[PDB]
Design a protein around this ligand. Structure first.
Ligand code: CL
Ligand code: CL
Lengths: 305, 297
């Protein structure tokens, strides 16, 4: 077909697999551009055999027909209003029975959110956007209201979550615990703390407070983002090629090959000469969550309300 | 310079060309031996299924032939659960070293508590819980390579996402589901559906499906014409009673019986034939087990 825009009964959707793969065009032979998660609300923009969708970070891309559940605004609103079970562990499964030896229904990853239906033993009974029923261990998940109540969004808590992803593979366009790109590591960590910021490194580079890094690095702080790339010239604007999370003491955690810690101190064993020489600036963003457009929490984000 | 290597991340992503903006073509696993064909900033590699593609320089450990051979001779710890992590200490609350997926193999160095001490190709040291892994000798001494066990493994992947070129427990494509399942049973077959279609024994499906058996592959696509050869588009694993398990959106079970609620009309209409392959492991170039495959020997 070529349906654009979508009819009202199919203008909205919810992702119903653990991690779905958005591509630049509606075909497998197009590059992946981002990913969305189980239970995540989306807008459905058009259909040509694949759906073009918009995720809550305003990013757009294309997914196969079978991986989202399209729906009316009314049904989308019902999904969003139901208290969720929030997956907090990186990896696990949901099961047919309250027993991890039973038939799985699907994998889950951190940030996956399913409708809470009940509880049985050491499990939450849950349902998927498509109507599947399952059980999730209380050891890898928890009810959304209590999750929010206990949620920490300080820099140290955020860095701990980044450290929990040590060695996970780099994957281009990767935006989940399964695999991450440079900007996707940032997003995957933040989403585990209920925070959404822009998807691409080139957009993350212009959020919050710009920090012109001092020669001694004294004005860059743990929790800032550090950006790398091609410096602006008279004839050409700057190009952002890479991002990491600053750790203090010239160290930073990032996704390149895998998630790892590097240094900008030439004396350190983990010195990353290539990126250090391409260092551009830092950004301090955490103070401005819900204070500028494009940076928000899911309790405030308009896709969720 | 380097002609050999070993993958040192859980799952690496091979692409058509040496750049991120080229399509993924297959994936390889932690501890898997590879041949290194060239370097242009990225490495062109060949995986043990004889498939080639490109990976970022940081994701494999290039080695001399002697070091490659030593890696291969080292007894491994084999990861048997779909997902987990290896840790800095024998404690799942300690700092992780990396994620792991089923089929990952690391060098066995010892044990502490209920954990194997392991090492990576690049030299990292870690601990893997005995609850998600098994020593290679014991793995081989308990190996299941029958149809029923292979189907059980496929069922254990229910609902996992479809991922184009996906070849691990994280996400699989149609042919990748077949490969991912089979590697958990020590079996390697060709990577692409268009090659899988011509292995083993070709089954010309009877109208009652009576000559198709559990564990056969079913192939879907475009029928040959007078002017044009057949095109293989899709593959699934036959479960009997006209059902098959496959990766399309996610891993799920479909039927070729129009009466069934899980009838898949699109694919049923495109059914071409089935293939009985399991009897022919180690009997044709490109189908083998890792104890016979020359990459490992
Ligand atoms: Cl990649
Ligand atoms: Cl995909």
């Amino acid at each position: 077909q070529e349906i654009r825009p979508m009819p009202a009964d199919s203008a909205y959707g919810v992702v119903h697999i653990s991690v779905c793969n958005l591509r630049e065009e509606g075909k497998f032979t197009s590059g992946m551009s981002t990913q969305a998660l189980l239970g995540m609300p989306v807008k459905v923009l058009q259909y040509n055999g694949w759906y073009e969708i918009q995720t809550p970070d305003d990013y757009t891309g294309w997914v196969h027909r079978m991986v989202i559940t399209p729906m009316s605004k009314e049904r989308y609103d019902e999904w969003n209003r139901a208290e969720k079970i929030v997956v907090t562990s990186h990896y696990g499964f949901a099961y047919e029975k309250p027993d991890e030896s039973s038939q799985p229904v699907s994998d889950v990853v951190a940030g996956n959110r399913l409708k809470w239906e009940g509880s049985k033993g050491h499990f939450y009974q849950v349902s998927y956007p498509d109507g599947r029923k399952a059980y999730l261990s209380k050891s890898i998940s928890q009810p959304e209201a209590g999750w929010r109540a206990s949620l920490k969004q300080d820099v140290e808590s955020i860095i701990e979550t980044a450290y929990s992803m040590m060695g996970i593979p780099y994957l281009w366009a990767g935006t989940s615990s399964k695999g991450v790109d440079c900007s996707g590591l940032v997003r995957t960590v933040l989403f585990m703390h209920d925070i959404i910021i822009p998807r691409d490194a080139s957009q993350q580079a212009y959020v919050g407070e710009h920090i012109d890094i001092a020669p001694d690095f004294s004005n860059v702080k743990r929790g800032d983002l550090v950006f790398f790339g091609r410096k602006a010239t008279a004839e050409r604007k700057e190009g952002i090629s890479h991002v990491g999370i600053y750790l203090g003491n010239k160290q930073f955690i990032h996704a390149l090959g895998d998630v790892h810690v590097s240094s900008m101190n030439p004396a350190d064993q983990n010195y990353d000469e290539f990126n250090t020489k391409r260092l551009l600036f830092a950004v301090r963003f955490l103070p401005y969550i819900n204070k500028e457009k494009g940076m928000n929490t899911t309790n405030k984000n308009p896709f969720y309300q």
